[PDB]
Design a protein around this ligand. Structure first.
Ligand SMILES: CCCCCCCCCCCCCCCCCC(=O)OC[C@H](CO[C@@H]1O[C@H](CO[C@H]2O[C@H](CO)[C@H](O)[C@H](O)[C@H]2O)[C@H](O)[C@H](O)[C@H]1O)OC(=O)CCCCCCCCCCCCCCCCC
Ligand SMILES: CCCCCCCCCCCCCCCCCC(=O)OC[C@H](CO[C@@H]1O[C@H](CO[C@H]2O[C@H](CO)[C@H](O)[C@H](O)[C@H]2O)[C@H](O)[C@H](O)[C@H]1O)OC(=O)CCCCCCCCCCCCCCCCC
Ligand code: CLA
Ligand code: CLA
Ligand code: CLA
Ligand code: CLA
Ligand SMILES: CCCCCCCCCCCCCCCCCC(=O)OC[C@H](CO[C@@H]1O[C@H](CO)[C@H](O)[C@H](O)[C@H]1O)OC(=O)CCCCCCCCCCCCCCCCC
Ligand SMILES: CC1=C(/C=C/C(C)=C/C=C/C(C)=C/C=C/C=C(C)/C=C/C=C(C)/C=C/C2=C(C)CCCC2(C)C)C(C)(C)CCC1
Ligand SMILES: CC1=C(/C=C/C(C)=C/C=C/C(C)=C/C=C/C=C(C)/C=C/C=C(C)/C=C/C2=C(C)CCCC2(C)C)C(C)(C)CCC1
Ligand SMILES: CCCCCCCCCCCCO[C@@H]1O[C@H](CO)[C@@H](O[C@H]2O[C@H](CO)[C@@H](O)[C@H](O)[C@H]2O)[C@H](O)[C@H]1O
Ligand SMILES: CCCCCCCCCCCCO[C@@H]1O[C@H](CO)[C@@H](O[C@H]2O[C@H](CO)[C@@H](O)[C@H](O)[C@H]2O)[C@H](O)[C@H]1O
Ligand code: OEX
Ligand SMILES: [Ca+2]
Ligand SMILES: [Ca+2]
Ligand SMILES: [Cl-]
Ligand SMILES: [Cl-]
Ligand SMILES: [Fe+2]
Lengths: 135, 37, 243, 32, 450, 95, 334, 36, 30
């Protein structure tokens, strides 16, 4: 099928919010993901710690749930531990620390929104997303 | 990237490094023109 | 290892040697009646290995046999942290806490049998006689320690059989798969006995050195066979924090 | 856009250059 | 000289052999080829600059020349952050223009310049059998090579320094004030075993040794240059060697094959002359980084990584080297000779130190280990990064991989060329490179074997 | 004959989160547990009953509340060294 | 005249039944050392802990192997790239347990084969031949060096050298494919073209010469007796062979120059083997075969499989099982 | 072990020296063609 | 005892090699 509006329709926030990426928003999100995230997030996994993957179940199990776009953007601004207790802004790339993550200092809020949307859309296109490292 | 004043010749610098391959090919062109004497 | 650097130490074998205190050393470490003292960098360097051979006759003395190490200078426990507590009567209790407290070691015996064993001091609690108001050349810490299975429960045998992973049957023989006793893997927690004869105490710096003899079982290969009895004699060193 | 267009312009000019030299020498009687 | 098979005896596909005795034409070929080399340097540098995103690491962008400039201390600061992009551009521009000049000269000599130089000048005219003249050319070029080594030294000492990945406070461009001229260190490098843990000269691990060895190399080359200008080959050399143009070519081919192999190994293993800041991690570095990353993660999870035994009974995270040193466990046991600026702070005299591991690990070391582990020099030919079973979304092949593979291949084929030309030079000197003479076929005058 | 881990899978261990035997990945389903509270739980094992998990020394009020909230998911079995030795509760070789 | 001169004339003598030469003065000792150690180890070596995990692998006949399964096992992963001669072992038993025989045999064998190539040049020089047979032999030498030295160097351990055994060779190849996708590497494809084409050209050349043999015998005796060793005349009709072949395909695809034909016969397999040796040598630095995994996406973005994806599945199946106890961490970087 | 190491060192040194001095002994002259 | 068979066949091949070299049919020019 086409990359339909429903395919691009993803939860926007935790209160039932819903947003639809445009084809261009999705393509730029994919491009950014391939450029800076696939390093340790190839196929939705996490090479450096695969207890915390990009799969929908892992994303929804985080505290608070990260399976919506606002939570993803918030994590990308201020990364935290999976139970939301430890501050990982020294340990995960984020736009808030351009001094240690320069690979990210050129990204806009639109760019982070797009990559978060892609992180939410890619799992429904690949059953292997967020699986075991060899899978 | 190239310093700002030079980015109108950006699509020229894109093809510069591959020229010595053309030199190697040109050797064969020249030998073909002379009939591979 | 004396007081060198890793550049001086690399590829020499000194990294597998427990430090020694001195020669003009006959000090004693005073201890309070009911306080406990930390042990900082406890080291054990084995030097002799004996395996109790099992006669086929019966009822006859088994005679520990000297083995030779096939694994290289990879046989020493070090950077171990512990504690020594002084009982009400004067007992001294040495308790291992953590560190590099195990080394797998394979010894060759006369006849060609190779004996791997899990040389360790894990969870060793050992005691002296009461009435010790000092740590000195007569301090004997005799006690017990735990010996985990040599192979962990994640190990796979050459037929991909294991305990919490792998097959539970001989898959290469489809009509005889469930026939073999080794289809069941086991990791019993074996038991060891150790004695720590303190022979040299430098109470100024708190370092204690001495001799040890340990008794423990060998590898069973996940319960494939009965463990042999392995005896290890060596030397040890550690710092005791007085304050 | 236009980047492939300009790239192919430079590439084609460069490509023709060598054969142009050989052709001119051959036609004008130069040493080859 | 002739320009066809009847008048030269060489087909078109061996046409450059027609140049063996045309010294002016040969000089033109050499100068034009040097123009090609300098042209590639300049054009590749400009391409890399144009295709450079200066806030992304060099090794993530398929750059092999910019790291060479950065290592020399141009355009970079602490940790390898690209300060000024202009010096890279200048290196490229200068090489391009000079290549134009060299190509003009090579074309002049190859096409119109005098065919041979010997009746034009004794200084530039040469004969391959003229041993004194050949040693004169050796002497001139040795003087030049020593001068170039001293240029490296002068850049490191008096012209802003070179990038020192081992600098305290972080890797940085620093000026080398105390090169080690001590010949014990310099020439004991040459005596170290070419095996694991020794690393014959690949193991040079501090810029002081590199600069001091380059001072020694400069002096050796200049003195040898004078020695060869002022002497002729001795009797033993005359009796041992073939004295012909093709023989000298074969000698140089053997030398080049050796250097190509050495460079491939050098870039694969050495992280001092090839800082990981610009070239990415070595394979050893990436393996050690993965071990460190999971030691750190599991320790944060509460694992007591000193006492945790793996499935086989060896320590999961830590173990002993065969000489007793405390090393990372797992398959990376093979890489325990690795030394890197991010890992040495956790190393004690006995190897990895439990106290430092438990309380001295810095967040920047964790970040560096994660980066190096995820940029391991593994990748497909079409530049798909990671292990070969990974899927297509990571576009990365380490510059170390490109350089090492390319230069091993070039070293091998130059060994082949050396064999070809050495055998041919011997046969031609003895006069049977054109085949067996039917009249005097040597085997016909030999006793039968059995 | 089941070895010992499969025999554990016969028990409540194979049905829910065992406080004495489950690996730390098994706690990820409980929101707010992995990794901090899960590591704290594994550190303070064994527990004779599920209720003494609330008696972890140095526990925190939010952690107390989370443990009370998810008491239902927990069971306690005899700590089998098969699952425990070598820090396999932290890293059983699964990624 | 002098003693040394007499020795020189003996070593470089073309009247020796086996030419010795100066390269032979190294070849003979090293090759004999390698052969004796290999035979002894293959028969009777005790098990070797190849993966450095105290998991010894039995390679010798006396420890339960047959000829197919027997091998000289590569040295331990714990050794890595360290030099492990006999005199660095505490005992011979330790040396054997850590795979020292592999290092001894391999190093001597490599020196021997390089000296064999030099010796080929040397004898060609002494006999007044052209010098390039050794260049052809440099292809198998390059391949052997790639699998015994270069690949272990790039991978960082002699445990990742090819075992000296039949089944060990197969294990090497399977793991190599799992880790590098050598089948999808163009240099290995060129090697396959080299050997397939070399066999093809061997079959054609032999069959065309045999087909065009000049009649010199009767129907009883072997046609081979129609050729006499050292005869000046040609034993087959190359013109008839050219007529046949140039009509089989077409005229201008057939060699009528025997010299060009034989150069082609030499060059094709040699070049192919050079390329495949370089392929292994560069996969030693993990520059692997082509990766087209999930290269084809449908319009929505779902992956459409190709045969490359099925191949990748097979590779993963090999990858997850190999050296099943050796890996502690998720990525197989070493 | 040390005796073995010394013996191997001598044997290898002798064979290498043989190879070197052999190729230094006017080897290009040892051929059936031209000796110049 | 199948080790004996393996050793036997290998030794047969090696002996064939030595005889084929040492006691070969001499090539003779006639
Ligand atoms: C004529 C002369 C013939 C001479 C013969 C003498 C033998 C030559 C071959 C040696 C064989 C070495 C095998 C093991 C190689 C090895 O352990 O590793 C490679 C070594 C480098 O050694 C490594 O050196 C490293 C140095 O890095 C260290 O120091 C660095 C400093 O930056 C880093 O900090 C790094 O982390 C740290 O580990 C480490 O010590 C490693 O442990 C160590 O293994 O290369 C070297 O020393 C030497 C360079 C090797 C060249 C590659 C072989 C070329 C083969 C070509 C075959 C062609 C055939 C064609 C045929 C037809
Ligand atoms: C019978 C017939 C058989 C023949 C069939 C046809 C064969 C033709 C001859 C070869 C033609 C090759 C295809 C040319 C296109 C190409 O190559 O395409 C590749 C690139 C152009 O494509 C670009 O290739 C890039 C490659 O990645 C590089 O760039 C990336 C993004 O920056 C990353 O940084 C990555 O790490 C880095 O490696 C990216 O994929 C870009 O997206 C992509 O656009 O051209 C280049 O690189 C140019 C490379 C020239 C130098 C190559 C040096 C090789 C060095 C050592 C070789 C060792 C061993 C060889 C083994 C085999
Ligand atoms: C500095 C190094 C060097 C120099 C100066 C020479 C010089 C010479 N060589 Mg030589 N050679 C070398 C290295 C060198 N070689 C190496 C490394 C090898 C091993 C492969 C050889 C193998 C070799 C052989 C077999 C022969 C020579 C011959 C010659 C003589 C004539 C060759 C000629 O006309 O070129 C002509 C050029 C061509 C025909 C074009 C060849 C193109 C090659 C095969 C492919 C190029 C691939 C390259 C990487 C680019 C890839 C392109 C890709 C994009 C498709 C000449 C004096 C001949 C001789 O002996 O003369 C007496 C000869 O028979 N060489
Ligand atoms: C680096 C590569 C290289 C170089 C420097 C040379 C150089 C040379 N070759 Mg040669 N050759 C090569 C590769 C090379 N070859 C290859 C790959 C082959 C196999 C096809 C051959 C086969 C071959 C044969 C058969 C012969 C030579 C010959 C020669 C010599 C005479 C040149 C001539 O008269 O032709 C004339 C060609 C022209 C006049 C055409 C134009 C050439 C110019 C230089 C083109 C430059 C274009 C450039 C972009 C313009 C920039 C100019 C400036 C503004 C910078 C000369 C020194 C001849 C020789 O040996 O002389 C005795 C000879 O017979 N070569
Ligand atoms: C190694 C390279 C090289 C060599 C050996 C030669 C050699 C020769 N050239 Mg040539 N040339 C070259 C490169 C080279 N050239 C280049 C790149 C160009 C393009 C600019 C030219 C253009 C050229 C022309 C137009 C002519 C020659 C001529 C000559 C011949 C006479 C030289 C002479 O006495 O004049 C005098 C030499 C000097 C006054 C010395 C000056 C030295 C240079 C120019 C100053 C820079 C020195 C520098 C610091 C040293 C290192 C260089 C640096 C790049 C590292 C001679 C055989 C002439 C000839 O063939 O006679 C009929 C002739 O007319 N050349
Ligand atoms: C590229 C640079 C270069 C080149 C081409 C030459 C070339 C030559 N030099 Mg030399 N030389 C140089 C640089 C160079 N030199 C420098 C920089 C110095 C100053 C130190 C010298 C000092 C020097 C002296 C004192 C002599 C020469 C001599 C010679 C001539 C014969 C020597 C020989 O056969 O070599 C090959 C070497 C041998 C055959 C000896 C064997 C050496 C060992 C056994 C080989 C083992 C190498 C080993 C495998 C490699 C490992 C690397 C490392 C660990 C050692 C020859 C034409 C001789 C001559 O005739 O003078 C006029 C001579 O007496 N040179
Ligand atoms: C023919 C020969 C042609 C050219 C010969 C080389 C000339 C190089 C001169 C430039 C030096 C810089 C001058 C200004 C300056 O001080 O540095 C300015 C900058 C930065 O350099 C800074 O210099 C400072 C001086 O106090 C300090 O030392 C700083 O630490 C240092 O970073 O340098 C550059 O950006 C220029 C790049 C230098 C690269 C030149 C080398 C290659 C040149 C030619 C190669 C051609 C080959 C053809 C064959
Ligand atoms: C001999 C011969 C040959 C060869 C030739 C050669 C080898 C050559 C060359 C040459 C060369 C080697 C050249 C060159 C050139 C260069 C140039 C011409 C340049 C330039 C410039 C420019 C123009 C630049 C510009 C720029 C700048 C300034 C900066 C910015 C960017 C740009 C780029 C724009 C052959 C083989 C063919 C054959 C025949 C014979
Ligand atoms: C810079 C540097 C350095 C230094 C280095 C050096 C100082 C060096 C050197 C080197 C050298 C100084 C070398 C060499 C060489 C040699 C050779 C390479 C040789 C040889 C030989 C030959 C070739 C021979 C041959 C022969 C024979 C065998 C016999 C007969 C005759 C003949 C001739 C054939 C260091 C590392 C410190 C640091 C880093 C950097
Ligand atoms: C699409 C149609 C088919 C396209 C075909 C493309 C391939 C055609 C051949 C490619 C060029 C080969 O080039 C060919 O080389 C031969 C060598 O025998 C030379 O052959 C010629 O040489 C010279 C030309 O200067 C003549 O004097 C001579 O009589 C003639 O034999 C020529 O240089 C050219 O005829
Ligand atoms: C003909 C060619 C020339 C032949 C001449 C060469 C002869 C052979 C020389 C070899 C020298 C012996 O090499 C010597 O080995 C001893 C072994 O005890 C090393 O000794 C060192 O390591 C060994 C372990 O092997 C320790 O037990 C010893 O306590 C320590 O000092 C020395 O550091 C080294 O100097
Ligand atoms: O050793 Mn024989 O193969 Ca080369 O990859 Mn890592 O190392 Mn082991 O794991 Mn897969
Ligand atoms: Ca990155
Ligand atoms: Ca561009
Ligand atoms: Cl395997
Ligand atoms: Cl591992
Ligand atoms: Fe034939």
């Amino acid at each position: 099928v086409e990359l339909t509006e429903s395919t691009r329709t993803i939860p926007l926030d935790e209160a039932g919010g819903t947003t639809t990426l445009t084809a261009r928003q999705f393509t730029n999100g994919q491009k950014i993901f391939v450029d800076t995230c696939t390093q340790c997030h190839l196929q939705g996994k996490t090479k450096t710690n695969n207890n915390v993957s990009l799969g929908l179940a892992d994303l929804a199990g985080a505290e608070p749930r990260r399976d919506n776009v606002l939570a993803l953007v918030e994590f990308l601004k201020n990364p935290k531990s999976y139970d939301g207790e430890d501050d990982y802004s020294e340990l995960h790339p984020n736009i808030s620390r351009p001094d240690i993550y320069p690979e990210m200092r050129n990204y806009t809020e639109d760019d982070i929104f797009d990559v978060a949307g892609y992180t939410l859309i890619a799992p429904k296109l690949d059953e292997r997303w967020g699986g075991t490292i060899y899978f | 990237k190239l310093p700002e004043a030079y980015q109108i010749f950006d699509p020229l610098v894109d093809v510069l490094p591959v020229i010595p391959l053309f030199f190697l090919a040109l050797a064969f062109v020249w030998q073909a023109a002379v009939g591979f004497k | 290892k004396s007081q060198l650097t890793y550049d001086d130490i690399v590829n020499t074998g000194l990294a597998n040697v427990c430090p020694e205190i001195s020669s003009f050393t006959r000090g004693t470490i005073e201890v309070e009646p009911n306080t406990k003292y930390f042990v900082s960098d406890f080291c054990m360097e084995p030097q002799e290995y004996f395996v109790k051979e099992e006669p086929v006759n019966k009822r006859q003395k088994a005679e520990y046999v000297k083995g030779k190490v096939l694994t290289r200078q990879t046989t020493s426990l070090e950077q171990i942290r512990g504690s020594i507590a002084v009982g009400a009567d004067g007992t001294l209790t040495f308790k291992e806490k953590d560190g590099i407290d195990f080394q797998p070691i394979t010894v060759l015996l006369p006849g060609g049998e190779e004996v791997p064993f899990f040389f360790t001091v894990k969870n060793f609690t050992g005691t002296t006689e009461p009435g010790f108001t000092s740590i000195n050349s007569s301090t004997d810490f005799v006690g017990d320690f735990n010996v985990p299975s040599y192979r962990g429960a994640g190990f796979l045998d050459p037929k991909a059989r294991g305990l919490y992973t792998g097959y539970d049957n001989a898959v290469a023989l489809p009509s005889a798969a469930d026939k073999f006793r080794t289809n069941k893997k086991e990791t019993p927690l074996g038991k060891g006995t150790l004695s720590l004869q303190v022979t040299q105490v430098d109470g100024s710096t708190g370092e204690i050195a001495g001799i040890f003899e340990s008794e423990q079982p060998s590898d069973t290969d996940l319960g494939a066979k009965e463990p042999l009895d392995v005896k290890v004699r060596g030397i040890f060193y550690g710092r005791v924090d007085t304050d | 856009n236009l980047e492939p267009i300009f790239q192919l312009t430079f590439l084609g000019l460069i490509v023709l250059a060598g054969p142009a030299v050989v052709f001119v020498l051959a036609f004008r009687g130069g040493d080859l | 000289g002739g320009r066809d098979l009847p008048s030269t005896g060489f087909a078109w596909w061996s046409g450059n052999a027609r140049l063996i005795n045309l010294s002016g034409k040969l000089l033109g070929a050499h100068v034009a080829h040097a123009g090609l080399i300098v042209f590639w340097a300049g054009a590749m540098t400009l391409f890399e600059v144009a295709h450079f995103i200066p806030e992304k690491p060099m090794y993530e962008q398929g750059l092999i020349l910019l790291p060479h400039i950065a290592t020399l201390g141009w355009g970079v600061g602490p940790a390898g952050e690209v300060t000024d992009i202009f010096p890279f551009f200048v290196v490229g521009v200068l090489h391009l223009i000079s290549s134009a000049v060299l190509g003009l000269g090579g074309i002049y000599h190859a096409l119109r310049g005098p065919e041979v130089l010997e009746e034009y000048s004794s200084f530039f005219g040469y004969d391959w059998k003229d041993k004194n003249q050949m040693t004169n050319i050796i002497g001139y070029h040795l003087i030049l090579l020593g001068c170039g080594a001293l240029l490296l030294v002068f850049k490191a000492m008096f012209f802003g320094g070179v990038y020192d990945t081992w600098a305290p406070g972080g890797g940085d461009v620093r000026v080398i004030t105390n090169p080690t001229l001590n010949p014990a260190i310099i020439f004991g490098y040459l005596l170290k075993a070419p095996f694991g843990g020794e690393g014959w000269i690949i193991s040079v691990n501090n810029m002081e040794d590199i600069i001091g060895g380059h001072i020694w190399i400069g002096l050796i080359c200049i003195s040898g240059g004078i020695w060869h200008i002022l002497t002729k080959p001795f009797g033993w050399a005359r009796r041992a060697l073939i004295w012909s143009g093709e023989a000298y070519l074969s000698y140089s081919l053997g030398a080049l094959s050796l250097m190509g192999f050495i460079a491939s190994v050098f870039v694969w293993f050495n992280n001092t002359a090839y800082p990981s800041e610009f070239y990415g991690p070595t394979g050893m570095e990436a393996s050690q980084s993965q071990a460190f990353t999971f030691l750190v993660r599991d320790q944060r999870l509460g694992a007591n990584i000193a006492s945790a035994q793996g499935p086989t009974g060896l320590g999961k995270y830590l173990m002993r080297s065969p000489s007793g040193e405390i090393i990372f466990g797992g398959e990376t046991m093979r890489f325990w000779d690795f030394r890197g600026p991010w890992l040495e702070p956790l190393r004690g005299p006995n190897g990895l130190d439990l106290d430092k591991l438990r309380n001295d690990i810095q967040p920047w070391q964790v970040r560096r280990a994660a980066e190096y582990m995820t940029h391991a020099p593994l990748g497909s030919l079409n530049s798909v990064g990671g292990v070969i079973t990974d899927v297509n979304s990571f576009n990365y092949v380490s510059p170390r991989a490109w350089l090492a593979t390319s230069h091993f291949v070039l070293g091998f084929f130059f060994l082949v060329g050396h064999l070809w030309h050495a055998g041919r030079a011997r046969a031609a000197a003895a006069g049977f490179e054109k085949g067996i003479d039917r009249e005097t076929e040597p085997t016909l005058f030999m006793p039968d074997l059995d | 004959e089941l070895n010992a881990v499969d025999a554990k899978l016969t028990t409540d261990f194979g049905q829910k989160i065992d406080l004495n035997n489950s690996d730390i990945r098994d706690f990820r389903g409980l929101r707010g547990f992995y990794p901090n509270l899960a590591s704290e739980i594994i550190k303070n094992a064994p527990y004779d009953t599920v209720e003494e998990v609330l008696d972890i020394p140095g526990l925190s009020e939010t952690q107390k509340s989370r443990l009370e909230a998810n008491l239902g998911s927990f069971t306690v079995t005899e700590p089998s060294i098969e699952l425990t030795s070598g820090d396999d509760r932290i890293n059983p070789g699964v990624y | 005249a002098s003693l040394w001169e007499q020795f020189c004339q003996w070593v470089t003598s073309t009247n020796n039944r086996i030419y010795v030469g100066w390269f032979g003065t190294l070849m003979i000792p090293t090759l004999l050392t390698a052969t004796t150690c290999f035979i002894i180890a293959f028969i009777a070596a005790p098990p070797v802990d190849i993966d450095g995990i105290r998991e010894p692998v039995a390679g010798s006949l006396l420890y339960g192997n047959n000829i197919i399964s027997g091998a000289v096992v590569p040295s331990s992963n714990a050794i890595g790239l360290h030099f492990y001669p006999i005199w660095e072992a505490a005992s011979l038993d330790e040396w054997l347990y850590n795979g020292g025989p592999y290092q001894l045999v391999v190093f001597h064998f490599l020196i021997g084969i390089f000296c064999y190539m030099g010796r080929q040049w040397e004898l060609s020089y002494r006999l007044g031949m052209r010098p390039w047979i050794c260049v052809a032999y440099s292809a198998p030498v390059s391949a052997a060096t790639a699998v015994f030295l270069i690949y272990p160097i790039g991978q960082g351990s002699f445990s990742d050298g090819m075992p000296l055994g039949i089944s060990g060779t197969f294990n090497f190849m399977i793991v190599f494919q799992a880790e590098h996708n050598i089948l999808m590497h163009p240099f290995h494809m060129l090697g396959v073209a080299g050997v397939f084409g070399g066999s093809l050209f061997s079959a054609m050349h032999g069959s065309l010469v045999t087909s065009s043999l000049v009649r010199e015998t009767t129907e009883v005796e072997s046609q081979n007796y129609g050729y006499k060793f050292g005869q000046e005349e040609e034993t087959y009709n190359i013109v008839a062979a050219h007529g046949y072949f140039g009509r089989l395909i077409f005229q201008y695809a057939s060699f009528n120059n025997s010299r060009s034909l034989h150069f082609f016969l030499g060059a094709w397999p040699v070049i192919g083997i050079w390329f495949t040796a370089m392929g292994v040598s560069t996969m030693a630095f993990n520059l692997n075969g082509f990766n087209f995994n999930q290269s084809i996406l449908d319009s929505q973005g779902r992956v459409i499989g190709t045969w490359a994806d099925v191949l990748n599945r097979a590779n993963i199946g090999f990858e997850v099982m190999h050296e099943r106890n050796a890996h502690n961490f998720p990525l197989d970087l070493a | 072990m040390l005796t073995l190491k010394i013996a191997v060192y001598i044997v290898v040194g002798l064979f290498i020296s043989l190879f070197i001095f052999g190729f230094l002994s006017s080897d290009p002259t040892r051929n059936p063609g031209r000796k110049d | 005892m199948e080790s004996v068979a393996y050793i036997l066949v290998l030794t047969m091949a090696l002996a064939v090699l030595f005889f084929a070299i040492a006691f070969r049919e001499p090539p003779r020019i006639e």
